[PDB]
Amino acid sequence: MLKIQAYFNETADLPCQFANSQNQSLSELVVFWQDQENLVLNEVYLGKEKFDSVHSKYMGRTSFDSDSWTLRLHNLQIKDKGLYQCIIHHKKPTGMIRIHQMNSELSVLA
């Protein structure tokens, strides 16, 4: 578990650290970022940013870099502290299978 210390009103950059050794198209992956309550901050559904699974309280607050595989959460509040998870799935004909995950613990200092 990676630990990140960030600051109130500023930003957190959370990473997935994914090597794509499996080596496939982002159009073949479902990537999302989940909080400790399993609510979704951000989803990249087969290469397309999606807001269908995103909790309304996270709307507008995040940005996913498809280069670094990193999520930026902006305008941090004390409440934003806790465990975050990056989960990466391969899309199959009938479902999807988890192929990677990375957890970060965030502190938000005053």
Chain residues in the site for a copy of itself (CB under 8 A):
2-7, 10-13, 15, 104, 109
| Residue 94: CB minimum distance to a copy of itself, A | 37
| Residue 109: CB minimum distance to a copy of itself, A | 6
With contact defined as beta carbons under 8 Å apart, do 30 and 43 qualify?
yes
Q: Which is nearer to a copy of itself, 7 or 82 (CB)?
A: 7
| Residue 13: CB minimum distance to a copy of itself, A | 6
Q: Which is nearer to a copy of itself, 57 or 74 (CB)?
A: 74
Nearest to 31 by CA among 72, 74, 80, 69: 69
| Residue 11: CB minimum distance to a copy of itself, A | 7
- Taking only Cα atoms into account, the Rg of the chain, rounded to an integer number of angstroms, comes to 14
Nearest to 44 by CA among 7, 80, 88: 88
Nearest 10 degrees: CA dihedral of 87, 5, 59, 84? 20
Q: Which is nearer to a copy of itself, 11 or 66 (CB)?
A: 11
Q: Hey, what are 90's tokens?
A: 């391969």
Q: Which is nearer to a copy of itself, 2 or 78 (CB)?
A: 2
